[PDB]
Design a protein around this ligand. Structure first.
Ligand code: CA
Length: 223
């Protein structure tokens, strides 16, 4: 997250870190045994880390649970990033509490202008590299479809939305991928892509979660 703020420990209780020996992507806990992330975060050997603030210090609220299964969206296209969503099942259910909690799936899609919370452990610099130990947060509005398409000609599908600031300076970034965009208490987006980070006229692009609720629910119901 570039241009954000320190969230505060366990203030984003649905945020998870995906770990394969190190943090490599975010995700969102959607019930006690399932996480939503980005398909481009797929790999084998995932351990889901819940209850994290500092990802380099055991602070006492963590739960570390291996994945038993990954399910990349049927129609994921890694060239275009269309359908950039996957589900991860935990080998055991997380113990839900105030600090480790699921986030609601949307009933309805969110509109441009709605203010959302984007979070992660990704790079905090738009030039160069600095990766934080503690969770970072950014409040950002959803942008109109028109302005998203104008920023990224030939690239925005019906399964994507833009959020952030056209002036630059405030965005998600590498290492935030797969993490949440939460608006009025519902998971509306997944950190997906963007040209650089926090560049003028290059807002963040996010997977449009409301399009996937039926797939998520029926996948959970049979897996
Ligand atoms: Ca920790």
């Amino acid at each position: 997250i570039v241009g954000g703020y320190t969230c505060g420990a366990n203030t984003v209780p649905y945020q998870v870190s995906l770990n394969s020996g190190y943090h490599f992507c975010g995700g969102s806990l959607i019930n006690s045994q399932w996480v939503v992330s980005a398909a481009h975060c797929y790999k084998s050997g995932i351990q889901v880390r819940l209850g994290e603030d500092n990802i380099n210090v055991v602070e006492g609220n963590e739960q570390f649970i291996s994945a038993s299964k990954s399910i990349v969206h049927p129609s994921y296209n890694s060239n275009t990033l269309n359908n950039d969503i996957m589900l991860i099942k935990l080998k055991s259910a997380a113990s839900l509490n105030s600090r480790v909690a699921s986030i609601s799936l949307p009933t309805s899609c969110a509109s441009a202008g709605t203010q959302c919370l984007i979070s992660g452990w990704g790079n905090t610099k738009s030039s160069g590299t600095s990766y934080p130990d503690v969770l970072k947060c950014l409040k950002a509005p959803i942008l109109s479809d028109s302005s998203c398409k104008s920023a990224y000609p030939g690239q925005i599908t019906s399964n994507m939305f833009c959020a952030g600031y056209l002036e630059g300076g405030k965005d998600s970034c590498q290492g935030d991928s797969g993490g949440p965009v939460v608006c009025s208490g519902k998971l509306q987006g997944i950190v997906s892509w963007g040209s650089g980070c926090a560049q003028k006229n290059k807002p963040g692009v996010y997977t449009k979660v409301c399009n996937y609720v039926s797939w998520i629910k029926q996948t959970i119901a049979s897996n």
